[PDB]
RNA sequence: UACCUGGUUGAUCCUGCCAGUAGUCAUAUGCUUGUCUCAAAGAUUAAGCCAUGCAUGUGUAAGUAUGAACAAAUAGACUGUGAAACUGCGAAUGGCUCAUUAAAUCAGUUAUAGUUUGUUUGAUGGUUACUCGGAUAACCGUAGUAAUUCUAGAGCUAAUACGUGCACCCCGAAAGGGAUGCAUUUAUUAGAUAGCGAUGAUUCAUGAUAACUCGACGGAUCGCACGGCCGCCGGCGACGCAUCAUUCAAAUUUCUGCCCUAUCAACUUUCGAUGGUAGGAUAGUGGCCUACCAUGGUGGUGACGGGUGACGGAGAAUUAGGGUUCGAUUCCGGAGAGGGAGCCUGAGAAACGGCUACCACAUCCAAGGAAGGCAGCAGGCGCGCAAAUUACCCAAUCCUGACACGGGGAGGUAGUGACAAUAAAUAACAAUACCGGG
RNA sequence: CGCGGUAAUUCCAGCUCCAAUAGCGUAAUUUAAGUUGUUGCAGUUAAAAAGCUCGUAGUUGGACUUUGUGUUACUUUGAAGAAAUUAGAGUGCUCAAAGCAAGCCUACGCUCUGUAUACAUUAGCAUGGGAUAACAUUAUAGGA
RNA sequence: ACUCCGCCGGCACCUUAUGAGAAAUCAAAGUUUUUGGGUUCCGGGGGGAGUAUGGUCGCAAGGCUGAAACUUAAAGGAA
RNA sequence: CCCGUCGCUCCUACCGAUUGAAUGAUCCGGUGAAAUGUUCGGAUCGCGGUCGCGAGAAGUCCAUUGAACCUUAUCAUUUAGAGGAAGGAGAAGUCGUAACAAGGUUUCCGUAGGUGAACCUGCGGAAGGAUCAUUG
């Protein structure tokens, strides 16, 4: 026996069931674009999480109301839709649940709001900001653009303190030009 | 197998050592004694695993050879010594002093004693029958045997033992109306009132016991362990004092913790 | 060797089992120890399971007898066996058996009947044994016996087991019984 | 995501299949390959064959030291450490593999009032002895053989080795005598009632009595500490024997449940098939076996037989629901160690990193003999569509021994690794030129 | 399905474009398949009613009994049930697949820190219900 | 015997769709994705083929039972 | 549009004298290693008073378990076969014209006989007919 071999890992997306349907490729290709995606594997996970979530409201809607089942874990659902800001507080039932869409979930991606907040100029700018360690949630440095962001973290979103932008030295670009003008 | 199995795989450990299923390919393996295998707390996992006093199995060895850990009063050099309900584990070095109960999720917590609490323990008769030269003698769930038994004790009494004089000074009978907990099953560590005995000839014995908030429940006969005589334990019980609350009313408790902490 | 198995036999339908694993020690047999009526006693100690042991005894002469009746027993020598109900084979072989119906001698038993009833078959001495002639009857049948200075036994012990050949003198209906399975 | 599209006609609506579409902890192969985490890996064909190395040994204050051993000391038995060797224990776990096996294994559920169980834990063991005897190893020195943990003879000496041994009833001139621990075997007897225990249920637990056995039983053992009484008494431990309970387990066992096949309809029973009685054997139940007796037992609710590229299950893939397919492999159970069979030791094995034989393969030889078992780890050959290093380590997990310390190819670490899975680079921005829109 | 017989959108190439993308192509099984149909398919003519009737097992069987110690199925609740896996609660391994951790303040520490819970055919065990249904039973009452 | 009204049973026919169906057509071939009264037999693309083989029945002719290899992108129904 | 014989090539399967062959398994029988139990045996060793007591190897005897080999028989799987013979495939073979129109003899089913070939004929049946129709 080996212990790893006990070590679980899992699949995060699933392909089309229709590779060449245009009007998909259409609007796949509209959300890529907008918000900066690497690939479709990007979005396609964005809506196998999606598809697992509205799963889990429908088998609790389909209980009794008084169910303890339905009543606990219903809750719980409810509570981690809050926490990353895909509902509000005025929605409070497992059928606004359903309603969610894949835009709620790619605007709470830390890629998303570290353009809509300003300190990126366009979409892409974020992402290579993003994976070049200069963004940090917290006290934490982040070099995911999927990391999902939590209502409490949005607001502690800044640059790194090592970063050029965030108080650190300048790169390894501008030392090099300043010492060739020096030099001169 | 031609013969005894001397391993136990951690996946196959009991659920309730709440052993990480990565930290290796094997469990300790309880050694023979007064508890049975899967009804018991390794010293080693006691040490090391609740206690941190041990980083390693190792260390365990250490500790145990020098003398300074002690069970029901005697000390115990064996790691894989089965420690179960209702034993005394003493530590004269931290002056520490605990019995082993189950908490309210079926788990064995180490509940610490005061001085005075810990010269006794709590044992269920197995059984009474005459020995050899007609002497009658009782055995218990935790493998004792006592010779002369007061003529009263039956079998599933509860007899309170003095660890120092190794004698019988208390008992109580079971009958409807005791407070008692269970240690086995789905309700494992829950603690109620003995409502009712149903009898089944041939079968096993089911008894219904209410909780102190009106919450019922029914068990085997030997999950059931008396603890005192009408309402009141003749052991100190944990915090939750074998109260079972709903997922809904611990998650309501977590919420308003995290308000105040 | 020798196996208890089951593997071997038919089904209770008749079909055949077909071997799925080799005998095990746990299931063996041993040979019969075949017990004969002989003055060169020997009983040869047999290792068992568990460490434990067993007595086989291939020769005996002389067993340990009750007289039920009288509530006393002694040991006796063994003359001869007269019937086998399993195989009349084991009596003219003189194999010693549990439930073997044999002669033992006499002797031992009168002496104790001359010394308990003053009876062939000091003033307080013969105080008691007028005393316990009141209430003594004897069996015609078993009387009768006492002549020749046999008496028909039953064995109550397995030889091959124990080592040893113990049983109870006859009477009552069941010596009926066997006389009459003698009487030819 | 509860979904369909192309193809028969001159055209149409159908039936219907072929083809396409998507997945697979699903294998192989092709081309390609920067980074992080994670990770399967000679199952499928051959349970085919294997060079070499390694995978099981083991020492506490506490069984046995006179190494002609070391160290430190200086008329004493020994009493610092200790190789070797005897003794004790372990090697029946683990690891590997899936060949045989279709009410069998196995699963859930039972039973043992049908048994055995080293160890652990608890309890329990009667009213020459100031300490017995003979051996043997290491050692020592004569050796044999081509040769092996192949082997012979001689001289020594130990024990927790081996063999020994202090250790109420009956008779009765009420003296005296017999029996009188525990266990063993048989018989008689009590075990109530509703002094006198338990069960749904036992002539059960257990008691008394008569005898029985040629009983591995009832300590000829070791460490430490020294004290208290005037030679006597005495502490805390170690190891060991026996009995019961307990624990660790096994064995057997109740009920229900398994794929395809009737071009398998009858099967079983002289030589056990089904049952009965009495025995034998077994740890114990039982046709398990023997003698005798009876004629039963199973079957379209599929017996019996055949097939399986069939170990069973937990589970895996895909799944609106129902379902279909898979399940060699790390957890559990079973089974096997080239094929059969037999067996010793032991608490435990029908053991194979134990033995004996046959058969099949195959090694060494001085040709007289001798030694063999990788479906352990690595590695090699072969087979194939198909699968990695003859690496490091006991540090973690745990197991084992006389043991806090030794050992562990179990296990871990690294190497190989596009089986599979996760995150995620290969550019961003501004100004010009060019091109749009509002 | 078809393309190629001298003006090839289909072959061999260049260019350009498309899909997925550190991956992608090719060679048992699930889906599609309501083309195995219990849910849920067909049998006048498309593949498919036995020539006809009888008949045992099998399968299926009218209505009626209280509304206003006969035996079972069924239903309800409960007990017992390995873990791992699955579902699922908690938790910012930087995210994630995962893991079973951690958190709190800054003392010689604390939160008794956490390591929930559900599911688990069929058979078996035990309570409540008695409609529906099966078997058994009934007039010389061997009746109460 | 004939005439008129009606009831039950039978062989059929005619009109019609509110029905069904791919349609032809059907008062059942209706009461079916709003899918479940009971039960037997029987089909699963076209061929190979009702052939080979085994069994069984028959005097025989043959009957009953009944494959596979392989081949093929249609064959077929109504209009 | 279309049917069959015949002729040519290839592919798959079948029948087939050979008392075919090979491989594997099983039954019965024969022989039978080893072990164990038993019987006898007493090399040798020890202990007592040149006789006793105890232990005991080789070997031997009977029985049990029983590998292994060798028969006959059966089954399973694979495979050769002169010759016979079926089906299918293979742009553009020979002979006719049977099926499709009333297909030029309406077609078809069962059965029987016959003919180079499709087919023809006899008997009974069907319309899936080329007639839903004569109270004339
Ligand atoms: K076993
Ligand atoms: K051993
Ligand atoms: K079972
Ligand atoms: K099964
Ligand atoms: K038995
Ligand atoms: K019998
Ligand atoms: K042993
Ligand atoms: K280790
Ligand atoms: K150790
Ligand atoms: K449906
Ligand atoms: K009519
Ligand atoms: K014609
Ligand atoms: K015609
Ligand atoms: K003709
Ligand atoms: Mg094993
Ligand atoms: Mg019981
Ligand atoms: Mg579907
Ligand atoms: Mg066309
Ligand atoms: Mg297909
Ligand atoms: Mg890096
Ligand atoms: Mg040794
Ligand atoms: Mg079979
Ligand atoms: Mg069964
Ligand atoms: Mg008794
Ligand atoms: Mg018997
Ligand atoms: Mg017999
Ligand atoms: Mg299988
Ligand atoms: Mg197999
Ligand atoms: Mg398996
Ligand atoms: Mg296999
Ligand atoms: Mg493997
Ligand atoms: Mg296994
Ligand atoms: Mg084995
Ligand atoms: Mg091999
Ligand atoms: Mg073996
Ligand atoms: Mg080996
Ligand atoms: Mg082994
Ligand atoms: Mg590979
Ligand atoms: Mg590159
Ligand atoms: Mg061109
Ligand atoms: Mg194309
Ligand atoms: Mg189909
Ligand atoms: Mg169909
Ligand atoms: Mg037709
Ligand atoms: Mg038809
Ligand atoms: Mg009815
Ligand atoms: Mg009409
Ligand atoms: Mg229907
Ligand atoms: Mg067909
Ligand atoms: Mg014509
Ligand atoms: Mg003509
Ligand atoms: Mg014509």
Excluded at chain 1, 36 to 64: H, P
Excluded at chain 2, 10 to 22: F, G, Q, S, T, V
Excluded at chain 3, 26 to 32: F, I, K, N, S, T
Excluded at chain 3, 84 to 104: D, F, G, M, P, Y
Aim: positive net charge.
């Amino acid at each position: 026996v080996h212990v790893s071999f006990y070590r679980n890992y899992g699949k995060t997306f699933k392909k089309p069931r229709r590779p060449y349907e245009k009007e998909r490729l259409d609007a796949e290709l509209k959300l890529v674009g907008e918000y900066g995606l690497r690939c479709k594997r990007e979005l396609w996970r964005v809506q196998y999480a999606l598809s697992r979530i509205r799963n889990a409201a429908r088998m609790l809607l389909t209980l009794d109301e008084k169910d303890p089942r339905r009543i606990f874990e219903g809750e719980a659902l409810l509570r981690r839709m809050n926490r990353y800001g895909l509902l509000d507080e005025s929605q409070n039932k497992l059928d606004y649940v359903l309603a969610l869409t894949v835009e709620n979930f790619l605007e709470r991606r830390l890629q998303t709001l570290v353009f809509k907040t300003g300190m990126a100029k366009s979409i892409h700018h974020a992402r290579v900001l993003i994976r070049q360690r200069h963004i940090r949630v917290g006290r934490q440095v982040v070099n995911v653009a999927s990391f999902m962001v939590r209502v409490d973290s949005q607001k502690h979103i800044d640059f790194s303190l090592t970063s050029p932008f965030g108080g650190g030295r300048p790169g390894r670009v501008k030392r090099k030009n300043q010492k060739s003008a020096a030099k001169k | 197998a031609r013969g005894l199995k001397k391993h136990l795989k951690r996946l196959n450990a009991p659920k309730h050592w709440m052993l990480d299923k990565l930290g290796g390919a094997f469990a300790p393996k309880p050694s023979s004694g007064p508890h049975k295998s899967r009804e018991c707390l390794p010293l080693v996992i006691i040490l090391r695993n609740r206690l941190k006093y041990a980083l390693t199995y190792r260390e365990v060895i250490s500790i145990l050879m020098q003398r300074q850990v002690m069970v029901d009063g005697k000390v115990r050099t064996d790691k894989t010594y089965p420690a179960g309900f209702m034993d005394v584990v003493t530590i004269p070095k931290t002056n520490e002093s605990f019995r082993l109960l189950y908490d309210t999720k079926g788990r064995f917590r180490l509940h610490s004693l005061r001085d005075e609490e810990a010269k006794f323990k709590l044992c269920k008769v197995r059984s009474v029958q005459f020995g050899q030269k007609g002497i009658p003698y009782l055995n218990t769930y935790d493998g004792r045997t006592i010779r002369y038994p007061d003529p009263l004790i039956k079998a599933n009494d509860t007899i309170k033992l003095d660890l120092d004089s190794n004698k019988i000074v208390d008992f109580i009978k079971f009958d409807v109306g005791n407070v008692v907990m269970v240690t086995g099953g789905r309700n494992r560590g829950r603690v109620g009132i003995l409502k009712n005995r149903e009898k089944h000839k041939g079968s096993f014995e089911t008894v219904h016991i209410q909780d102190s908030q009106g919450h019922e429940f029914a068990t085997r006969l030997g999950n059931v362990f008396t603890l005192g005589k009408g309402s009141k334990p003749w052991v100190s019980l944990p915090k939750g004092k074998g109260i079972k609350l709903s997922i809904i009313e611990e998650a309501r408790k977590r919420m308003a913790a995290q308000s105040a902490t | 060797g020798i196996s208890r198995d089951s593997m071997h036999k038919r089904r209770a339908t008749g079909g055949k089992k077909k071997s799925w694993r080799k005998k095990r020690k746990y299931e063996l047999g041993r040979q019969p120890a075949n017990t004969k009526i002989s003055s060169n006693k020997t009983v040869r100690r047999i290792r068992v399971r568990g460490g434990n042991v067993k007595w086989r005894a291939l020769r005996l002469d002389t067993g340990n007898f009750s007289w039920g009746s009288e509530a006393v027993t002694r040991k006796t020598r063994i003359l001869d066996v007269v019937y086998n109900a399993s195989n009349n084979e084991l009596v003219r072989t003189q194999t010693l058996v549990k439930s073997a119906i044999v002669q033992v001698d006499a002797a031992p038993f009168k002496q104790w009947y001359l010394q308990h009833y003053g009876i062939d078959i000091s003033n307080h001495v013969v105080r008691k044994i007028e005393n316990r002639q009141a209430d003594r009857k004897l069996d015609s049948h078993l009387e009768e016996q006492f002549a020749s200075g046999r008496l028909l036994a039953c064995i109550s012990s397995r030889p091959g087991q124990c080592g040893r050949a113990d049983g109870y003198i006859l009477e009552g209906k069941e010596l009926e019984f066997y006389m009459k399975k003698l009487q030819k």
